[PDB]
Amino acid sequence: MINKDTQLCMSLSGRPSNFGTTFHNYLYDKLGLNFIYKAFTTQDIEHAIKGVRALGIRGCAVSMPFKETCMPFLDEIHPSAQAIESVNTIVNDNGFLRAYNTDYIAIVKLIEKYHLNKNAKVIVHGSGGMAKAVVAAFKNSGFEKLKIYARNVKTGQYLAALYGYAYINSLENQQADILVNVTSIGMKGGKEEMDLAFPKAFIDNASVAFDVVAMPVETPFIRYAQARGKQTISGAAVIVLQAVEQFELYTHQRPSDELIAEAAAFART
């Protein structure tokens, strides 16, 4: 039951999804919070962000293609967003817009949650999407042994140079303990849906398979890792935790694990 004091939280993207509108509104209801959430789009990021401030909108998720173009209009870029020079979350504190990156925060949190060993050898396959957030999260968690495997050579080399890691154009001779997929390989509907993000021989020799692809959870990479009894981390965990972190920033409440799982189930539908 909306009233004048209800706070609006929102998202801005070139192609809005229903995930956050479903997920956040469910949790507001369950937690007794006088908040509503809606996804929006725009063709004018400048006046959209200036609008969020002027209208007293509390919270705004930022998606492609605005994660960098929003930044000139914000008041304070927090370390999560500084770490990868990209914003996915804005919190309006009485007109002062503070910027975060909860994809980065989520990845750091999952590294910790799964007790990944900073002495282990990591290979990241991919140079786009979540690659930068992944690479930075590992670096700032103290991992020194990481290689970026990617088909885009210049972007691959850049990411390695920026974070003090190495670039490889192939997997020959390489061993690794932690395999992370940040490509579109395995994505439902993609041309690479039924492809492996890493070769079986590589997965066999690894201990951890972390696939940032979220749909399906059971990509060929994840499924094979499970068939070999390896530890797995799925992209669904990333999407959910990054949303939870936004929710907590906006409302000052962290929902329980039980309610997050119900909300996630409500929103996958």
Side-chain angles (χ1 to χ4, degrees):
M1 320 107 124
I2 304 163
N3 57 56
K4 73 194 180 57
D5 293 314
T6 299
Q7 295 127 97
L8 176 62
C9 290
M10 65 176 274
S11 66
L12 283 168
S13 341
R15 288 313 284 290
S17 151
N18 267 312
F19 172 79
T21 302
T22 299
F23 183 84
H24 287 90
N25 287 125
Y26 183 85
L27 292 164
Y28 304 143
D29 178 67
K30 295 286 184 152
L31 284 185
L33 286 155
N34 191 20
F35 274 69
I36 56 165
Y37 195 98
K38 199 185 101 68
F40 293 82
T41 191
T42 185
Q43 301 187 274
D44 185 353
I45 194 53
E46 174 180 2
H47 297 292
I49 299 305
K50 292 171 174 181
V52 162
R53 178 189 298 108
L55 296 173
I57 291 176
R58 174 53 185 168
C60 183
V62 189
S63 289
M64 281 199 70
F66 307 129
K67 291 190 177 173
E68 302 79 36
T69 61
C70 70
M71 296 183 61
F73 304 109
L74 310 177
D75 299 299
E76 187 178 80
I77 311 291
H78 276 249
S80 54
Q82 294 179 314
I84 57 174
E85 298 300 344
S86 190
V87 172
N88 88 329
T89 304
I90 303 159
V91 185
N92 183 5
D93 297 301
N94 308 290
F96 191 79
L97 305 186
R98 302 190 161 95
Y100 303 83
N101 193 303
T102 60
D103 285 327
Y104 170 86
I105 299 168
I107 293 146
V108 170
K109 292 195 164 334
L110 291 161
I111 283 166
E112 182 168 281
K113 180 171 170 162
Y114 281 90
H115 309 296
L116 301 190
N117 180 177
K118 69 177 194 44
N119 294 314
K121 287 164 62 168
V122 184
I123 296 182
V124 176
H125 190 180
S127 65
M130 290 269 265
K132 204 177 176 177
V134 167
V135 174
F138 277 100
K139 180 72 180 23
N140 294 340
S141 295
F143 286 64
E144 298 294 10
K145 294 201 197 342
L146 187 152
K147 300 176 192 171
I148 287 107
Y149 171 41
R151 65 179 168 77
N152 194 133
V153 171
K154 274 199 168 250
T155 305
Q157 279 166 334
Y158 170 62
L159 281 186
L162 187 69
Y163 297 98
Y165 286 142
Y167 170 77
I168 59 179
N169 196 63
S170 55
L171 296 171
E172 325 312 289
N173 293 171
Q174 301 294 332
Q175 92 111 70
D177 305 302
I178 299 170
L179 310 178
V180 191
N181 176 52
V182 297
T183 65
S184 59
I185 290 165
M187 287 183 76
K188 174 157 116 107
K191 67 182 185 173
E192 290 177 302
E193 188 177 343
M194 302 309 171
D195 294 345
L196 286 166
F198 290 83
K200 292 189 283 290
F202 231 81
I203 305 167
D204 286 341
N205 289 139
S207 62
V208 182
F210 182 1
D211 198 341
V212 183
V213 171
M215 177 65 90
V217 174
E218 296 284 333
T219 56
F221 172 42
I222 293 291
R223 273 229 162 76
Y224 187 78
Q226 291 176 339
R228 298 295 162 163
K230 308 307 191 169
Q231 181 174 290
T232 63
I233 310 178
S234 149
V238 179
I239 292 179
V240 173
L241 184 50
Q242 73 207 53
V244 170
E245 296 282 328
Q246 296 172 325
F247 184 101
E248 188 179 342
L249 283 164
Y250 306 153
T251 64
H252 296 126
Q253 288 186 50
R254 181 177 303 175
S256 69
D257 294 332
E258 175 175 2
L259 227 50
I260 294 160
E262 295 182 277
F266 186 66
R268 283 331 271 183
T269 79

